[PDB]
């Protein structure tokens, strides 16, 4: 007794044969038992059609001879009736079986069938030379002469009106924001029906919800009544917008009575606050349904953005003084790409700060100063100050901030004077755009660009994917040379701007190159997604944007760790070949490499709690970098392209020569220094774990003619169970270079230890947790214990080019450590806080050659606070990127008690910074100017719904609407204490910083105004807060928003002022008029009746309606611009929607879901009919 489907999809029911009716559905099965689907089959004397997927019997039409015929569900042909086809079209067939066409009267009703014989529903036309609307239900012609609105003009005032009216028309008696009212506003009524018995004058604390007494429309009123009924306040009820106004008002009062009884019973109103809050979120105008939540682009993070507008008439506190330039990223600093995808994605997260405003620019510099002098200012400790910065989210802010930061460092530290000054304040950019490197270099390299081209290639060739990987050949970028000729090496001057940033095929330091940092992973690259995919994969969460708890994170982390360390060698979430990647990263010339905490220690749990399996290898590479890495570079592959010839291995060989050795063939230094002889390094790496060499094949490392006949020993060698690490010359296998300086390797190798036994080793691809491919690193034997191959930076003015950083051996001697993970657990104890640990362990990083320590952002997390909209992981994981107070870096509570960040107190931070200076390392401050989270104070902004670049969404009604945002800072926080304080001192000492014009604005920064308190006027926008398009209350009739700010310009519903509010439709000799629930006449506005029909009322206050012999199509231009367009109003004023309408001359048009005419496009139908609309609107 079940259906089963085959591999093909044929279906049996156990098998039944012939005509049968399993579960009441008529089906036909062939003699072999297969279920008939999507065809006419003949059973008995009646032909039946069976449906495509279900196989159930249904009406259908087929063409017999040349005439359409109709077949019903029972297989009988249809005569004198309507019958459908599978597509969904209805036809009518006469007594002779033949389909009818055109205008037809049957059974005393008139239907319109088009040429194809399709019954047309929701179709307006002058059919009999007289208007006729064909029903949406059955297609039956009505004259559309009867008015469909059910609500006549009625007065609402009665004996309770003066009691429930507002005590006062001002901020005393009305909960409000900037004067405006909200759905969840409570107010002070004149009197209170205490206990449902006796009316008594109200006391100032006797506040009541506005929704107890007033509603924006009948739909909302009916929903309120039904909702409150369901909570014990009434016998559960169903009311509709169609219910009479009188009945709804009476029912509101019986609910009011019941409410006052439960207030007396509970002696509280908090239960009601929660009931109203809940109810309000139920309504679409007061929730995200009217906010157009979307997830494409950066909207993926939080669900969509609102851009604030400069609107001095309604919302003047929120005006930006014409300073809200969006998307001025480096490539668009001047707005010249505003109309293209080259406009920057200004909106990223939370409240987006307006960094195009000179006043805000000054404040960002104040903050920058505070960070670079944090120790001096907060502990009077001149050794506890940050040395350099990381600029977060470069492409999501105004690029002026780069110049501001650059020039500040020039002024205060003379970074443009020497490499020693510059390199004492190492500064990096998170600048992802592929054209940022060239911009950064044109602007003098004030901060180091990242080099994504190399990070990307690690992804393709090693780091990503179990198998199909780009060849190691791609690391060379041979196109750099003309014709890709590795023999002739003529640089291609006319190259297409496509390639890796720094060529390393034969890098002798002779050509100028763009200084940069590079990495394999980051706190925000190849971490956050895998870690979440793992949680999703094990059912811990459902979505990437899902909120998770720390325990949820801990459980997921256990699977992540299990996958990372899998002995199989396969990795589902984690990256492959990280050792091999680091080997290349750490040997490359002309880069400052950066190392990720999470490749050295586990990304979760406690800080430095447990090393990763990669730790030993990376640690060795790092120490070897200090000893051996210097001089020129070469790089080659046993490969010529995408595809491999017979002998070819695609094994990459990277070499460094030693201090002053720049070339393969250079035999000695120009200054006759000897340091080079025991320096240099050789790296061999493969991406093929199933690699086997031919017996003939030999693989060579050209260590250089400065290293003829020299003995080399292994640092690191891969094998089938792991990667061996050799700590000193004695414990490793040796091998000697030939006369030309080449180390030769074969399929089979017999190496000898310098002293001790022989060793056997195969050039063999391996597969295990540490590698999927090959890795060999070789170093010269005889290296001193204190050997240091690094170059000190020079104090002389090397360059008059104006530039700050220069890619050279001194810059290359640096190493940045990104020393945190976003997924660290919260400290279990004060002693295990990241910054305490960093202080005790500073030593360890000095010996790995770290010259600059990139610390996590130290700002106080906004945490679980959430005023609306989607929370982001930065906030609930307390990682420091999401913060309320920019100057609170772990200060104590005002009561004296400790109040650490996730990383510890402010003292812990100053101690951590000092400890790094005691060990000769710099400390990097994360500068995060793009946004700020969870501001506790509300303001009313004028907002438009936009995508990441601040462009209005295409099909949105959310345009210039009033919205309550959380934009105002407490005014009593550390932003209030330290805001703008250091600027005056700075203007006095370095006037030019304050006189220099910025590019995007034409203006200099403006310190004449200090920011102690944030507010909307300094913001570009916000992520959508799920409050609704009309949470700020508005009268539908006049479209004016209620307000009580100034007694001269009050606007309230008339009930609340104890005046008479009449509401409904009323006819007069001229036409039909409408009065809203608040008692105002509708003018120049669209109005919806209780049955769902829509009407437009013109300037004069009269419903628009079509006349006989005239065009029913009318052009509407309203106060509400988004609704402008061409509409089709019938004689009873009803707007045609989602259907075709004929004009007086016989032309057909189509009108959409919302009544607007559609032009210049194709349009589809539920029955699969296609139509075209010309530009003038007509239907071809
Ligand atoms: O991203 C740096 C990269 O740029 C070019 O190659 C791009 C891309 O070429 C194909 O799509 C391959 O499938 C990828 O692996 C390459 O990344 C340069 O040709 C390449 O040398 C360089 O690494
Ligand atoms: O619901 C289970 C379904 O299995 C199949 O796909 C059969 O064709 C269908 O008749 C049935 O209802």
Atom of ligand 1 nearest to the CA of 452: 1
- Of all protein residues, whose CA lies closest to atom 2 belonging to ligand 1? 453
Question: How far away, in angstroms, is 1083 Cα from ligand 2 center?
Answer: 56
**β-pairing verdict for 592-596 and 516-519:** parallel
3-state helix, strand, coil split of the chain in percent (to 5) is 25, 25, 55
CA quadruple 1095, 1099, 1100, 1104: dihedral sign: negative
Ligand 1 pocket, CB under 6 A: 453, 456-457, 460, 470, 474, 477, 499-500
Q: How remote is the CA of residue 628 from the centroid of ligand 1, in Å?
A: 30
Euclidean distance between CA atoms 1051 and 584, whole angstroms: 70
The number of the ligand 2 atom at minimal distance from the alpha carbon of 27 is 10
Between the CA of 89 and the centroid of ligand 2 the distance, in Å, is 25
Distance from Cα 488 to the centre of ligand 1, integer Å = 23
Distances in whole angstroms, Cα of residue 133 to Cα of each of 257, 1114, 1172: 46, 17, 22
**What would the two tokens of residue 523 be?**
């706190």
- Ligand 1, pocket-test mutation among 432, 457, 472, 652, most atoms within 8 A of CB: 457
Rounded to whole angstroms, the Cα distance separating 1068 from 619 reads: 90
The beta strand positions in 948-1033, using DSSP E, are 961-968, 1019-1023
CA–CA gap between residue 176 and residue 241 (Å, rounded): 28
Residue whose CA is closest, atom 21 of ligand 1?
Answer: 477
Ligand nearest, relative to CA of residue 12: 2
- Give me the DSSP letters along 132-146: EEE-TTT-BEE---S
Closest C-alpha among 989, 901, 867, 909 to residue 350: 867
Q: How many CB atoms lie within 10 A of CB 558?
A: 13
Among 3, 15, 39, residue to substitute to test ligand 2 (most atoms within 8 Å of Cβ): 3
Q: Which residues contact 1120 (CB under 8 A, 6 or more apart)?
A: 1039, 1085, 1086
Ligand nearest to the CA of residue 22, numbered in listed order: 2
| Residue 396 annotated as part of some ligand binding site | yes
Q: Considering only CA atoms, which of 392, 302, 347, 352 is closest in space to residue 822?
A: 392
Resolution (A): 3.0
Q: Is 55 in the pocket of ligand 2 (CB under 6 A)?
A: yes
| Cα 9 to ligand 2 centre (Å) | 11
d(CA 1089, CA 1074) in angstroms, rounded, equals 10
CB of 11 closer than 6 angstroms to any ligand 2 atom: yes
Nearest to 234 by CA among 226, 243, 244, 246: 226
Specify whether the CB–CB gap between 969 and 1013 falls below 8 A. Answer: yes
Please name the helix (run of DSSP H) or strand (run of DSSP E) that holds residue 975, with its range, or none. helix 974-978
**Alpha carbons 1123 and 1135: distance in angstroms, whole number:** 13
CB 305 within 8 A of CB 1024: yes
Select from 2, 22, 54 the residue to mutate for testing ligand 2; criterion: most ligand atoms less than 8 Å from CB: 54
CB atoms within 10 A of CB 698: 13
Q: How far is the CA of 470 from the centre of ligand 1 (A)?
A: 8
Question: What's the token pair of residue 1002?
Answer: 């034409």
Ligand nearest to the CA of 50: 2
Quick check: CB of 35 below 6 Å from ligand 2?
A: yes
- Closest ligand to C-alpha of residue 21 is 2
* Domain containing residue 81: CATH number: 2.10.270.10
Tokens of 978: 């330290």
H or E, element range at 404: helix 400-413
* Dist. CA 819 → ligand 2 center (Å): 58
Cα separation, 979 vs 994, whole angstroms: 17
Answer yes or no: are the C-beta atoms of 1102 and 1070 closer than 8 Å. yes
* Residue 278 Cβ < 6 Å to ligand 2: no
Point out the ligand nearest to the CA of residue 23.
2
Range of the domain at 71: 2-142
Q: How far is the CA of 91 from the centre of ligand 2 (A)?
A: 29
Q: Is 3 in the pocket of ligand 2 (CB under 6 A)?
A: yes
DSSP strand pairing (506-507 vs 748-753): unpaired
User: 785: annotated binding-site residue?
Assistant: no
CA triple 688-743-780, angle to 5 deg: 105
For ligand 1, what atom is nearest to the CA of residue 454? Answer: 2
**Is 56 touching ligand 2 by the criterion CB < 6 Å?**
no
Q: Is 866 annotated as a binding residue?
A: no
Residue of 451, 455, 460 with the most ligand 1 atoms within 8 Å of its CB, for mutation: 460
376 Cα–ligand 1 center, Å: 47
Among candidate residues 527, 331, 294, 586, the one with its CA nearest the CA of residue 433: 331
| Strand (E) or helix (H) holding 441 | helix 436-442
Cα(18) to ligand 2 centroid in Å equals 17
Q: Which helix (H) or strand (E) holds 368?
A: helix 358-372
Nearest ligand by distance to the CA of 434: 1
Residue 179 in tokens: 């004067």
| Ligand 1 center–CA 481 separation, angstroms | 15
Q: How was this structure determined?
A: X-ray
Whole-angstrom Cα distance, residue 511 to residue 508?
8
Cα–Cα distance measured from residue 320 to residue 1020, given in angstroms and rounded to the nearest whole number: 9
User: Coil, strand or helix: which one is 864?
Assistant: coil
DSSP 1041-1096: BPB-SSGGG-B--GGGGT---EEEEEE-SS-EEEE-TTS-B--SEEEE-TTS-EEE
What SS3 state is found at 430? coil
**What is the CA 538 to chain-centroid distance, rounded?**
24
- 930 annotated ligand-binding residue: yes
Nearest-angstrom CA–CA distance, 128 and 123: 14
Tokens of 1071: 């036409």
38 lines ligand 2 (CB under 6 A): no
Please identify which residue in the block is written with the tokens 């992520």.
Answer: 1023
> Which atom from ligand 2 is nearest to the alpha carbon of 37?
8
Q: Is 944 left (phi over 0), alpha (psi -120 to 50) or beta?
A: beta
With beta carbons less than 8 A apart as the criterion, state whether 462 and 473 touch: no
Task: Give the number of whichever ligand sits closest to the CA of residue 641.
Answer: 1
Burial of 146 (0-12, 13-18, 19+ CB in 10 A): exposed
How remote is the CA of residue 457 from the centroid of ligand 1, in Å? 6
How many degrees, rounded to 5, is the angle at CA 993 between CA 988 and CA 996?
Answer: 130
The residue to mutate among 474, 481, 484, 640, having the most atoms of ligand 1 within 8 angstroms of its beta carbon, is 474
Cα–Cα nearest to 1044, from 41, 24, 329, 166? 166
CA dihedral 527, 530, 535, 538 (to 10 degrees): -150
Q: State the distance from the centre of ligand 1 to the C-alpha of 587, rounded, in angstroms.
A: 20
Query: Which of 11, 25, 37, 39 has most ligand 2 atoms within 8 Å of CB, for mutation?
Result: 11
Ligand approaching nearest to the C-alpha of 473: 1
What's the CA-to-centroid distance between 429 and ligand 1, angstroms?
Answer: 23
The per-residue DSSP string of 244-276 comes to: -HHHHHHHHHHHHHHHHHHHHHHT-SHHHHHHH
């Amino acid at each position: 007794k079940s259906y089963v489907a085959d591999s093909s999809g044929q279906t049996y029911y156990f098998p039944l044969i012939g005509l049968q009716t399993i579960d009441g559905n008529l089906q036909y099965f062939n003699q072999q038992g297969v279920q008939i689907k999507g065809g006419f089959q003949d059973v008995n004397n009646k032909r039946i059609y069976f449906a495509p997927n279900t196989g159930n019997a249904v009406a259908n039409t087929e063409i017999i001879n040349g005439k359409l015929q109709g077949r019903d569900a029972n297989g009988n042909q249809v005569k004198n009736a309507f019958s459908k086809d599978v597509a969904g079209n209805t036809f009518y067939f006469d007594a002779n079986g033949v389909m009818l066409t055109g205008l037809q009267t049957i059974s005393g009703k008139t239907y319109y069938l088009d040429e194809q014989g399709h019954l047309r529903k929701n179709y307006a036309g002058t059919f009999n030379n007289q208007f006729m609307y064909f029903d949406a239900d059955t297609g039956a012609g009505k004259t559309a002469i009867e008015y469909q609105f059910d609500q006549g003009l009625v007065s609402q005032s009665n004996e309770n009106t003066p009691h429930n009216a507002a005590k006062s028309y001002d901020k005393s008696s009305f909960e409000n924001v900037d004067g405006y009212l909200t759905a969840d506003t409570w107010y002070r009524p004149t009197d209170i029906l205490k206990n449902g018995d006796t009316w008594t004058a109200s006391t100032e604390t006797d506040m009541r919800p506005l929704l107890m007494t007033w509603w924006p429309d009948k739909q909302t009123q009916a929903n309120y009544l039904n909702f409150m009924s369901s909570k014990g306040l009434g016998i559960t009820t169903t009311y509709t917008a169609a219910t009479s106004q009188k009945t709804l008002n009476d029912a509101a009062f019986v609910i009011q009575t019941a409410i006052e009884q439960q207030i007396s019973l509970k002696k509280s109103t908090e239960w009601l606050r929660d009931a109203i809050d809940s109810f309000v979120k139920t309504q679409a105008n007061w929730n995200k349904q009217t906010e157009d939540e979307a997830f494409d682009g950066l909207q993926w993070l939080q669900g969509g953005f609102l851009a604030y507008q400069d609107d001095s008439h309604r919302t003047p506190n929120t005006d930006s003084g014409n300073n809200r330039k969006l998307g001025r990223q480096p490539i668009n600093i001047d707005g010249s790409k505003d109309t293209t995808d080259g406009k920057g994605s200004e909106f990223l997260l939370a409240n987006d700060i307006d960094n195009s405003n000179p006043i805000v620019q000054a404040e960002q510099l104040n903050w920058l100063h505070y960070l670079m002098n944090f120790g001096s200012i907060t502990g009077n400790n001149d050794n506890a100050n940050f040395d350099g910065i990381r600029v977060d989210a470069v492409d999501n802010v105004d690029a002026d901030l780069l110049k501001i930061a650059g020039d500040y460092f020039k002024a205060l530290y003379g970074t443009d004077k020497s490499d020693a000054n510059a390199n004492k304040h190492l500064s990096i950019l998170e600048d992802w755009n592929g054209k940022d490197p060239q911009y950064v270099n044109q602007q003098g390299n004030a901060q180091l660009t990242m080099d994504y081209t190399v990070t990307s290639q690690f992804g393709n060739s090693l780091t990503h994917g179990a198998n199909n990987r780009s060849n190691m050949w791609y690391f060379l970028d041979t196109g750099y040379y003309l014709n890709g000729d590795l023999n002739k090496k003529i640089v291609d001057k006319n190259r297409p701007n496509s390639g890796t940033l720094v060529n390393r095929i034969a890098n002798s330091g002779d050509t100028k190159v763009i200084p940069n940092y590079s990495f394999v992973r980051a706190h925000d690259y190849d971490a956050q997604d895998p870690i979440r995919k793992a949680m999703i994969d094990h059912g811990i969460i459902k979505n990437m944007q899902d909120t998770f708890t720390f325990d949820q994170l801990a459980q997921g982390m256990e699977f992540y760790y299990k996958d990372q360390e899998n002995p199989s060698g396969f990795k589902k979430y984690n990256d492959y070949n990280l050792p091999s990647a680091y080997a290349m990263l750490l040997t490359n010339k002309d880069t400052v490499p950066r190392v990720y905490y999470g490749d050295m220690y586990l990304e979760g749990g406690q800080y430095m709690e447990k090393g990763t399996i990669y730790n030993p290898v990376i640690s060795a590479l790092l120490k070897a970098r200090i000893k051996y890495v210097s001089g020129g570079q070469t790089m080659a592959t046993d490969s010529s392209g995408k595809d491999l010839k017979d002998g070819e291995t695609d094994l990459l060989t990277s070499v460094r020569f030693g201090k002053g050795i720049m070339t393969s063939d250079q035999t000695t230094t120009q200054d006759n220094s000897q340091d080079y002889k025991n320096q240099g390094i050789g790296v061999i790496v493969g991406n093929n774990p199933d690699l086997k060499l031919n017996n003939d094949k030999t693989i060579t490392l050209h260590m250089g003619k400065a290293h003829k006949n020299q003995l080399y020993r292994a640092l690191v060698l891969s094998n089938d169970s792991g990667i061996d690490v050799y700590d000193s010359d004695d414990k490793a296998p040796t091998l000697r270079t030939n006369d030309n300086g080449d180390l030769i390797f074969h399929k089979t190798n017999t190496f000898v230890k310098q002293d001790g036994t022989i060793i056997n080793y195969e050039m063999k691809g391996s597969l295990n947790a540490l590698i999927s491919g090959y890795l060999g690193v070789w170093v010269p034997v005889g290296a001193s214990d204190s050997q240091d191959a690094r170059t000190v930076a020079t104090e002389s003015s090397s360059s008059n080019d104006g530039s700050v950083f220069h890619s050279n051996a001194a810059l290359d001697s640096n190493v940045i450590y990104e020393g945190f993970s976003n997924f660290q657990a919260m400290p279990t104890s004060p002693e295990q806080s990241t910054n305490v640990v960093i202080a005790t362990k500073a030593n360890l990083f000095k010996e790995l050659g770290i010259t600059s320590f990139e610390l996590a952002p130290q700002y106080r997390s906004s945490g679980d606070t959430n005023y609306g909209g989607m929370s982001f992981l930065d906030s609930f994981l307390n990682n420091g990127y999401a913060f309320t107070d920019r100057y609170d870096l772990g200060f104590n509570k005002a009561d004296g008690n400790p109040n650490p960040t996730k990383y510890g107190t402010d003292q812990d931070l100053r101690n951590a910074i000092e400890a790094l200076h005691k060990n000769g390392m710099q400390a990097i401050a994360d500068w995060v100017p793009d946004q700020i989270y969870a501001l506790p104070g509300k303001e009313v902004v004028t907002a438009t719904r936009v995508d990441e670049r601040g462009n209005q969404l295409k099909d949105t009604d959310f345009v210039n609407l009033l919205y309550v945002a959380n934009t105002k800072s407490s005014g009593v926080d550390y932003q209030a204490k330290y805001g703008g304080e250091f600027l005056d001192k700075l203007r006095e000492e370095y006037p030019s910083l304050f006189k220099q014009n910025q590019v995007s604005t034409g203006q200099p920064i403006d310190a004449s105004t200090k920011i102690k308190q944030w507010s909307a006027k300094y913001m570009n926008g916000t992520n959508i807060l799920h409050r609704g398009a009309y949470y700020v209350l508005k009268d539908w009739a006049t479209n004016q928003y209620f307000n009580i700010a100034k007694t001269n310009e009050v606007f309230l519903p008339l009930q609340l002022q104890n005046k008479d509010a009449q509401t409904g439709f009323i006819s007069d000799a001229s036409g039909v008029k409408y009065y809203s629930i608040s008692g105002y006449q509708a003018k120049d506005t669209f109005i919806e009746d209780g049955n769902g029909n829509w009407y437009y009322f013109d300037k004069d206050g009269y419903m628009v309606r079509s006349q006989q012999g005239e065009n029913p199509i009318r052009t509407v231009e309203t106060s509400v611009n988004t609704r402008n367009g061409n509409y089709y109003f019938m004689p009873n004023g009803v707007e045609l929607r989602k259907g075709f309408g004929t004009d007086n001359s016989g032309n057909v048009y189509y009108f959409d879901d919302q009544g607007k005419m559609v032009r210049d496009k194709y349009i589809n139908d539920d029955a699969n009919n296609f139509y075209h609309l010309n530009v003038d609107g007509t239907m071809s």
